[model samples]
Target: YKKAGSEFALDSSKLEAIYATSEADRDYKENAVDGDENTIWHSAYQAADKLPVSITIKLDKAYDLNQIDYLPRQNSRNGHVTEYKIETSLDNENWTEVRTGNLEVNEAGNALANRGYNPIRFNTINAQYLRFTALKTLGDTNNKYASAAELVFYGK
Candidate 1:
């Protein structure tokens, strides 16, 4: 199923958050796909939530996926992913890795200057579920958390 629409009609509300983590006081897990730039999706905690984190999204209906985009946190000094990998699945259990690369962000200033969308374009891949894992972050410290302003998928 291929279409030109950027935002799919799939029910994001029904998308389950597996192995997902978020902060209470600020960013929540739902912030990733809430279509809001100001809000962010923050991971769990200090050490356990440092890196190698993943969040799953159930598409329910498999679509021809061509591109995946990630918007990092506005503040680079806080929580930003350095390296990440994307995987897709037909069944909820089985999965296949798709994209694995760096985010390429400037670690200088506090604001998210010069940094833009981290996109991964690939051949047509049809799937019902997606799992994005943050293998590494800008800061390797244990206090680091994987945060993002938005996550988008384009295809049909």
Candidate 2:
């Protein structure tokens, strides 16, 4: 533990999801934070390489965040999140971009398993809501179902 600050845990029970642009479904996005390694939260693919679909996460309150860890479906076979852009917001509308980029694996662009944690670290930010959009989904060069098995945010 650091003398300055210590790691703090946030209750996912207080977390809420707001999909800015995505397909409508009775499915639950909470599966990504439900601490289940097997279950996955996948965005509905409406087209082949179309609009950069967005998915948002809103915390109960603002907290200083340093790192975020993302996991893919366990025993994974298909659908891995590729390009993405992370943005933060106070209200659910306007947002400030935190970062924008993609993940590559073994000379391949979109990858499933073998990529551990796939952690993304930022300096430090405070916000009540976060929006992460999938610029590109899994292989085949088209917008397909993107999987996020679990999402872990670290902070104090």
Candidate 3:
């Protein structure tokens, strides 16, 4: 089996949160890839109709990536991702679905569980852009959103 390497060192200047649900002072897209787990990229606590919230990250360039890891907000479990799909693209306009899976409920009280990174694995892909779409979250559908303290990429 091929081993995955260290986490990709992303360039903040190159990263772009192309599409996100909420944009506020604290909920900036750069928070996700800033290499700090303390800061978070979160969506608005809007109506449940906003079920499928997503954040698209544009990397510096194409990378042969094998896995993408996600960490729920460190301080709270609100808006923790449940169901998700991963997509990749060379050009930002065109995209290819890479994988889809579910993550365990990131309970607030358990620091270990909340901090654990949910690995989304797929065959290595050459892509310059990656998108994480949260189809569902922890709270009720009526007032749920999406959030991530950190997003990591592993190379093959």
Candidate 4:
């Protein structure tokens, strides 16, 4: 058996027994990749293809999620993003708009160092998913793309 976090457990012995059967091997072989290099590497290259305009968080299990912190994508040179929105979901099927506001971007175009913007906080709400969507881009520049270093969440 295997334990994951405090809420999940798996019976590895039964899983291994299932994997040992000829029928299971045949089924697994049917879906297995044929060592194609292009297919294997596609996901890595696709990740940076364009600046992400929105992000979706998938929960390991349901929890009372209330807050999220995200750094909106910044332009390549001398630009900023001033506005964004915080949204949540119970089943990731229906979404409820939570909060929207203005935030300042740093001169270096980094979201972390900029000030006066409050870290996203909300009334305790139960959710299985969360998202941050960028609305408008600020500053005038020829740099047309935006990029984010990371997005993080805090909740019960």
Candidate 5:
């Protein structure tokens, strides 16, 4: 079972994908926040150096944020985050490490374990910026990338 939380919606101007280590031309950052699980924000192909891919999102103003919901690419099992870290910042320049742990595994036979939205929650904090980093990924030995089909930020 999974915990449920109210969804928070914001305009493009209010919520912006500020930066990413790398992104595929077609699977851009905006896709992750588009509310469409079919589309994905994926890291560009990186032969040997692709681990630790990350993306930062900024809000117009600080909000009492507590959780982030993430879903890996639905059609494929590649680039599923295994180890991740999340940070928060009230101001863009400064950040606080909030969460760091392994995501649910979804290996070959044990698929779907990480197929749905994986909620990563933290202590309620007022932050205008949030950063998500994929430290390691499943199927990275061949894929060498990371991706997100959807990413949701929840808070008041």
Candidate 6:
């Protein structure tokens, strides 16, 4: 498949593999089991559960992650995500703050909000692992939930 403005082809082979093999099925079962255990029950019947979530890739070696794209899931509010910060570490002992994006509650719906005010590019920083932290929330209905669809990083 072709991305809208790019010439590069997206390989659907991996996606096909997911459908063919039973690995996806097993993974889903395992995830569901884990999720059920962590769900918080309020007032016996009122239970708030953590949504299905995961990080796309975990960097094992030092690299630079340039960009990230995410969307808030439906029935989820982004208002709770007050502050988002990107952190990096080399030895995994100490971490340095690289970038921060403050979110404004947009009750309008699922729309891509490009943080235009912040620097588009964070200068080349070396790190073995990158951590994204979403701090605080404005809503009490659920944990500050957001749907992260894609994340892109540039490095050698």
Q: Would you estimate the TM-scores of all the predictions?
A: 0.76, 0.79, 0.82, 0.50, 0.85, 0.45
Cα lDDT tens digits, model 2, 1-156, are 362332454556656676645442533577767766776666665555254766688887887877667776666534567678888877878788999866656555445435666776777888888877777666444456666777777665
Model 6 C-alpha lDDT versus the unseen true structure: 0.37
lDDT of 5 by residue, 30-85 (tens): 78777778988888785656778888898878899888888889888777787789
Global lDDT scores for all candidate models: 0.68, 0.67, 0.75, 0.41, 0.79, 0.37
Stretch of 10 with least lDDT, candidate 1 = 105-114
Instruction: Tell me how candidate 1 scores on lDDT.
Output: 0.68
Q: Candidate 3's residue-wise lDDT over 7-88, tens digit each?
A: 4535456566777766545878888887788888878774444667788998877888888779888777767787899999
1-156 per-residue lDDT for model 6 (tens digits): 764423321221211111110112122312211222221111111244232222222354565545443223223333224456666667655878888765554566233244222122466687655554544333344343322212234443
- Top candidate by lDDT: 5
* Pairs of residues clashing in candidate 1: none
Each prediction's RMSD over C-alphas, in Å, is 4.3, 3.5, 3.9, 13.5, 3.0, 10.1
Shift of residue 26 alpha carbon in model 5, Å: 0.4
| Number of the top-ranking candidate, with TM-score as the measure | 5
Q: In angstroms, give how far residue 59 of model 3 lies from its true place.
A: 0.7
Worst 10 residues of 6 by lDDT: 14-23
lDDT of 3 at 105: 47
Residue-level lDDT tens digits of model 1 in 39-145: 87777665455567777777647887877778887764456776778889888798988878765545653333336676767777888788888877654353366
Off by over 4 Å in 4: 1-52, 72-80, 105-118, 138-145
Off by over 4 Å in 3: 1-4, 7-14, 106-114, 140-143
Better of 3 and 5 by TM-score: 5
Model 5: residue 41 alpha-carbon error in angstroms: 0.8
Query: Higher lDDT: candidate 3 or 6?
Result: 3
Candidate 4 local lDDT, 1-156, one digit each (tens): 542232322121111111111111122211112221111101011224322244455555566666554333232322234566777777777998888875655676544355322356677777766665545443233222222323344555
